[PDB]
A paper describes a structure:
Detailed structural information is available for representatives of many light-harvesting antenna systems, but not for the proteinaceous baseplate of chlorosomes. This structure has three essential functions: (i) ensuring the structural integrity of the chlorosome organelle, (ii) connecting the chlorosomes to the photosynthetic reaction centre in the cell membrane and (iii) transferring excitation energy from the protein-free BChl c/d/e antennae towards the reaction centre. Previous studies have shown that roughly 1,000–2,000 of CsmA protein subunits, each binding one BChl a pigment molecule, constitute the baseplate. The baseplate is oriented towards the cytoplasmic membrane and in the Cba. tepidum attaches to the so-called Fenna-Matthews-Olson (FMO) protein complex, which is the last antenna before the energy reaches the reaction centre.
Numbering used by the authors:
A (entry chain F), B (entry chain D), C (entry chain K), D (entry chain I), E (entry chain E), F (entry chain A), ...: 1 to 59
The structure:
Amino acid sequence: MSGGGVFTDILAAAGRIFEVMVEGHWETVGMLFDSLGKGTMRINRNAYGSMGGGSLRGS
Amino acid sequence: MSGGGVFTDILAAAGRIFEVMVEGHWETVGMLFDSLGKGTMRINRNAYGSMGGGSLRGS
Amino acid sequence: MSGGGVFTDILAAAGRIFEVMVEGHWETVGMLFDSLGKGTMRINRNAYGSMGGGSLRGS
Amino acid sequence: MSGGGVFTDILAAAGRIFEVMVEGHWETVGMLFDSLGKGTMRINRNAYGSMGGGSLRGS
Amino acid sequence: MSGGGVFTDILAAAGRIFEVMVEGHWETVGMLFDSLGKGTMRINRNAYGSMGGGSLRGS
Amino acid sequence: MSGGGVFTDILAAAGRIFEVMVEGHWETVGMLFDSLGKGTMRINRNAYGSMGGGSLRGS
Amino acid sequence: MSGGGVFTDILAAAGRIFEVMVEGHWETVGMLFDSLGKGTMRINRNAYGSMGGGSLRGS
Amino acid sequence: MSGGGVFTDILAAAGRIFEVMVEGHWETVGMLFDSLGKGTMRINRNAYGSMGGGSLRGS
Amino acid sequence: MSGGGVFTDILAAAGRIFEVMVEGHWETVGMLFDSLGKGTMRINRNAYGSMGGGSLRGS
Amino acid sequence: MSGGGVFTDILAAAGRIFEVMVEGHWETVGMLFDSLGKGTMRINRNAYGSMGGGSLRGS
Amino acid sequence: MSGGGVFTDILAAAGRIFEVMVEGHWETVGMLFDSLGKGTMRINRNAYGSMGGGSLRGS
Amino acid sequence: MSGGGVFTDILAAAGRIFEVMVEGHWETVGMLFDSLGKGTMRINRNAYGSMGGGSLRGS
Amino acid sequence: MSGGGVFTDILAAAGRIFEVMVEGHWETVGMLFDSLGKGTMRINRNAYGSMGGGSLRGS
Amino acid sequence: MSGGGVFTDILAAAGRIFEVMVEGHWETVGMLFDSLGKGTMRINRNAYGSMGGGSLRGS
Ligand code: BCL
Ligand code: BCL
Ligand code: BCL
Ligand code: BCL
Ligand code: BCL
Ligand code: BCL
Ligand code: BCL
Ligand code: BCL
Ligand code: BCL
């Protein structure tokens, strides 16, 4: 049976190799949700400007 | 019956020889189960990150 | 100053028109987050399967 | 921004497609440990046969 | 004095214009300090591995 | 200063890249001390075959 | 340093080796001392043949 | 096995040489953060100047 | 049997000769583990420079 | 029966002559077991060196 | 005196440079005294062999 | 001072080398005193043969 | 046995001769350690020139 | 039986003659052991030189 021992490893590889693909498989998501944030501020800064609730109507 | 005494020795040699094959018949297994341990870790690092169980719901 | 009264309506237009863009702007999101849900199921299944916590060690 | 909306579906696809690879990924392991079983029986049968422990030495 | 009134505006501009330069003058810093974090982890994962402080020497 | 912002990213790189050299660097050691245990056994086996300490001289 | 990792294995060798030399080395001794016990008998038998001590002289 | 002993020293070398890289690796950081300091003073000086808080309104 | 007494002396040899191979077979190891100690020092020097543990958080 | 008396002496000769063969028959054994001795010392010298039994575990 | 500021840095050098020379100036000594220990042993093995002091003269 | 370090050794050598000369310096003495022994027995065997002290003269 | 008495004198020689090699052998060591004491002084003199310990800080 | 009386004198001879051989036989020994005493002195003197035992450790 000497030589030809190429099975057994593979499993070690499927486990080890998969580490590379799964590791760089995340980094992409980070900015997706976060980047937007700024774009909604400009509409907010105009139309709205008077925080003062003021007196209550009918009282 | 002098000469021709080749039997008794085979039994000595059917046991002794078997020592060579059996001895190098176990080393293969060692790594099989082991090596894998590393691969499953990356998935577990990302999705899971907050050990903090937090407070109990409804209490 | 008969005629030449093409201002005023622009305001009506910008306000009215903005409805067309903004009312087609949203629809894109919806599916974005929702579709995913079907990819994580196939790894969760196989590696896990025994809900039975079993007895507590040391007791 | 009519058309050109081919980004959102990739996540849907990665989440989906991944299902095909992972679902055929497993089946290989099943027979890996189970097949063996039969091979160890033949040696056990010959060198062992008298279940009868017999009497205890010195008593 | 009619016409030639180009001064007063510069002040409105020196203040308004500076808004553009100062606004895109911060975004650069964000990643500088943060990105590094990851690189120092690998030396930490090897040489170190046994959290268990163990028993106290001389006691 | 538009473009030419190649400096900051290097830090991200020195930290991130070093992650490669260091990770591959440790694997060499594991086999080194371990493989030896087998060679010392045969000498030990012949000269030392009697465990029975026997009686104490002078008593 | 990819490839060129042929040292760490010599030790695995050397120790793994040596098993072969040492193991076939001992078999020589067994017969040396034992085969002799059959040559001393023929002189002992003829000159000596009367176990009977007989009576004690002077008594 | 006279000669051919060029392995052992590699460890000594990797351990020793690594000193050269790492002892030149640093140095770059030092000035990075410190320099800046002088740039923010010029704007703070002109728009601010009256330390005297003065009296409190409504008292 | 005058002359031809070349056996016996081999044993005197095999024992005596082996003294040579075994004696010059251990010296290799000495440097192996030792030499390394120096290389781990530089990383340890920079990142860690403040021994002062400081005060205890929350007290 | 004068002369021809060569039978009586042979016994005297067999008894005598045998002295020569038996006398030089021994000397060979002397160094057979004694020479070895030295060859086993070198392995003992290395792998063992700390006579100090040290403290007893668990006490 | 813009430009021509090459002094101060020499002092920065001269001290830093001296680190290289002094660092690789001690490693030479290590083996000097050590290596000798083995040589004096052979004379001491032969002439002296009987640790047993024996009885005291005149008593 | 790189290279030319051939002094520090030598001592290691005079100490080591001397082991070879001193080790084979002995051996010769062994048989010098011991071989004689036999040559004095033949005169003793003749001339003396009557251990019996016999009776004491004058008593 | 007239003449040929050249063995007994070798011992007288070996012992008498070795007197020559050993006698001139030692003279080498003397200078080795001693000559050094003069090179360490110069660095000691400049950096350290104030013996006066001075007052104790905090008292 | 006049003449031919040459026997009786041989005994006188053999006995008388043996004096010549045996008398010159001994002289060889004398120096053998005695000359050596001058070779051991030159190693004893350099390595040892301080007769003074000094104080006893721990007292
Ligand atoms: C005992 C159960 C073990 C296990 C046992 C196994 C076994 C057993 C096997 C795998 C295999 C695989 N495992 Mg697994 N695996 C485990 C855990 C995982 C998990 C998980 C999240 O739990 C996942 C998703 C993976 C992922 C994977 C894949 C890498 C692979 C299935 C085919 C594939 O996609 O390769 C896609 C691509 C590759 C495998 C890389 C090689 C592709 C080459 C051949 C393409 C041609 C190359 C071209 C000619 C040259 C140019 C290429 C470039 C330009 C350089 N494993 C579990 C815990 N795994 C199989 C495998 O390794 O493939 C044989 C396999 O036999
Ligand atoms: C938000 C977090 C989501 C997630 C979001 C993402 C996002 C976002 C992306 C991925 C991507 C991927 N995800 Mg995901 N993913 C999740 C859950 C999973 C899990 C999991 C176990 O939980 C795993 C392991 C996967 C697995 C995968 C891979 C299929 C893929 C990474 C590259 C790759 O290996 O494709 C290897 C092979 C392919 C992708 C198939 C296409 C390969 C083609 C381009 C090769 C050339 C074809 C040739 C020219 C034509 C001939 C081919 C044949 C002969 C027909 N995802 C998590 C829960 N995933 C990335 C992706 O889909 O790639 C763009 C990606 O952008
Ligand atoms: C994991 C630990 C497991 C284990 C797992 C393994 C693994 C893993 C392997 C073995 C293998 C073997 N094991 Mg196992 N084995 C276990 C228990 C046992 C026990 C025991 C008493 O406990 C024994 C003695 C055996 C016995 C054996 C042998 C059958 C075989 C080693 C080579 C050999 O001798 O095949 C001699 C002959 C054969 C294997 C039959 C095939 C021979 C063919 C190739 C010769 C040429 C054929 C010719 C071209 C065509 C004409 C032929 C005829 C004329 C028809 N195993 C333990 C419990 N065993 C190995 C094996 O099965 O070989 C691949 C192997 O890879
Ligand atoms: C703030 C402190 C941070 C840190 C901040 C920095 C900073 C700041 C810098 C580095 C730099 C480096 N860091 Mg760092 N670094 C940290 C942690 C580490 C640790 C550690 C184990 O803790 C180490 C040893 C490393 C290792 C390294 C090196 C990769 C690099 C020093 C030069 C070098 O060796 O590049 C050798 C080789 C390269 C850098 C790759 C590029 C080489 C090219 C230019 C050669 C020519 C290419 C040729 C023309 C094209 C063909 C090439 C091939 C055939 C394709 N860093 C700490 C935690 N590091 C410096 C750097 O990245 O270089 C400028 C740098 O400026
Ligand atoms: C760390 C301390 C370890 C140890 C580590 C080492 C290290 C390290 C090394 C050795 C080496 C050796 N060890 Mg070790 N070894 C240990 C334990 C043992 C013990 C013991 C009883 O404890 C012994 C005596 C051995 C015995 C041996 C020798 C086999 C070998 C020294 C040279 C030699 O004799 O090779 C004699 C012959 C051979 C090695 C076989 C190869 C000879 C070839 C090169 C000759 C030419 C072949 C020709 C061209 C082709 C035709 C040949 C045939 C016709 C087919 N080791 C101790 C416990 N050992 C060295 C070694 O193995 O050499 C590389 C080595 O590197
Ligand atoms: C037992 C565990 C030990 C250890 C044992 C090992 C072992 C074992 C090895 C290393 C190796 C390495 N170790 Mg280490 N090492 C330890 C501690 C450290 C620490 C640490 C911070 O603790 C670090 C990060 C280092 C860093 C390093 C690297 C220098 C090297 C991995 C490849 C490399 O980067 O070479 C980058 C470049 C070089 C090694 C210099 C030589 C490059 C040449 C070959 C390129 C071609 C030259 C060209 C043809 C000529 C022109 C060149 C110039 C123009 C003059 N070690 C740990 C504590 N280390 C390996 C090594 O050094 O490779 C042999 C190695 O064998
Ligand atoms: C009574 C039991 C005794 C004992 C009895 C014997 C007996 C009996 C024999 C051995 C033999 C051997 N014993 Mg032993 N031996 C004992 C104790 C030991 C111990 C031990 C650590 O206690 C060990 C490991 C050894 C080691 C060895 C080996 C040296 C040798 C087996 C072959 C070999 O390896 O030679 C490898 C190499 C050589 C033997 C050197 C000669 C090789 C030549 C022939 C190769 C060709 C030379 C070429 C043509 C010319 C160029 C060469 C160079 C370039 C100059 N013995 C036990 C305690 N030993 C056998 C032996 O000595 O060989 C005949 C043998 O017959
Ligand atoms: C610090 C004090 C150390 C010490 C330090 C030193 C130092 C230092 C030196 C010596 C040297 C010597 N020491 Mg010392 N030595 C110590 C302990 C000992 C002890 C002891 C019993 O404790 C003894 C007696 C020895 C013995 C010796 C001698 C081997 C040698 C003096 C010349 C000589 O005899 O070489 C006789 C022969 C040789 C040295 C072998 C080489 C001869 C070659 C050059 C002749 C020509 C070769 C020819 C051209 C080629 C063919 C040759 C063959 C046919 C193959 N040392 C003490 C404890 N020793 C000296 C030495 O080793 O010489 C350099 C030396 O420098
Ligand atoms: C009884 C125990 C006695 C003792 C008895 C013996 C006996 C017996 C013998 C020795 C012999 C030796 N003893 Mg001693 N010896 C004792 C004490 C000592 C001590 C000691 C520290 O106590 C030491 C280390 C020595 C040292 C020595 C060596 C000089 C020599 C072993 C070979 C050798 O090295 O010669 C190396 C070199 C020489 C001997 C000089 C002659 C070399 C010539 C033959 C080389 C060729 C010359 C060339 C053709 C002409 C050109 C030469 C020049 C250019 C002029 N003895 C003990 C106390 N010793 C042996 C001896 O004297 O050699 C026969 C020997 O037989």
